[PDB]
Amino acid sequence: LDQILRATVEEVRAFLGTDRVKVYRFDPEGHGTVVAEARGGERLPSLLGLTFPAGDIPEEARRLFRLAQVRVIVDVEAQSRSISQPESWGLSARVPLGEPLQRPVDPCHVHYLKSMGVASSLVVPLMHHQELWGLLVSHHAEPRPYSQEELQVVQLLADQVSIAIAQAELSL
Numbered sequence: 001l002d003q004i005l006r007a008t009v010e011e012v013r014a015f016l017g018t019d020r021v022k023v024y025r026f027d028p029e030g031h032g033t034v035v036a037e038a039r040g041g042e043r044l045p046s047l048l049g050l051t052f053p054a055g056d057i058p059e060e061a062r063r064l065f066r067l068a069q070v071r072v073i074v075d076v077e078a079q080s081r082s083i084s085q086p087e088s089w090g091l092s093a094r095v096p097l098g099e100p101l102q103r104p105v106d107p108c109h110v111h112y113l114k115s116m117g118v119a120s121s122l123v124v125p126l127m128h129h130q131e132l133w134g135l136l137v138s139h140h141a142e143p144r145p146y147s148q149e150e151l152q153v154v155q156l157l158a159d160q161v162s163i164a165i166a167q168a169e170l171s172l
């Protein structure tokens, strides 16, 4: 798996031309590891070999990803913010869209990205069937808008991997 994702992570970056994109897996114990990583020359540092905990992600945010599969983080400069609210229900209903074409990230996240000096970020969760095995994330030093058309082509490119991460689970 480690080897296969090393070649895949490189292929995406070359296409998305993003300075940094890597694969993130999740361990039931809460620990997460980056087993693959493509870097743009050397503007941003290498995070490979470093274990990141799931704490990085809460829950509600993941819901929309599991609900609307668009997966996009807007310019940390535009200052768009997401937030929690009193008890609520009917989310499982799976209502078509029903929300903006973006997923604002709470300030706590704003710094998280900015602290890394990244103005924008593209994501594409790696899931097999009904399960999520990891998280795809791209980072670059620029607050630029993304196109839905080009996004899909890659969205599919990630689907392929979904097969590799899955097909790999059996062999391994």
Ligand SMILES: *[C@@H](C)[C@H]1/C(=C/c2[nH]c(/C=C3N=C(/C=C4\NC(=O)C(CC)=C4C)C(C)=C\3CCC(=O)O)c(CCC(=O)O)c2C)NC(=O)[C@@H]1C
Binding pocket: 024, 032, 034, 052, 055, 056, 057, 058, 061, 062, 065, 073, 082, 103, 104, 105, 106, 108, 109, 112, 121, 123, 135, 136, 137
């Ligand atoms: C702050 C109080 C809370 C928080 C907010 C928050 N962040 C996310 C989710 C993400 N976390 C990542 C993780 C990564 N960056 C890396 O370097 C790595 C390698 C291990 C990863 C995979 C990022 C960039 C995301 C975006 C993906 C996603 O949407 O799940 C969000 C989502 C934004 C939104 O509101 O739509 C939230 C809510 N971070 C915390 O740890 C607190 C729970």
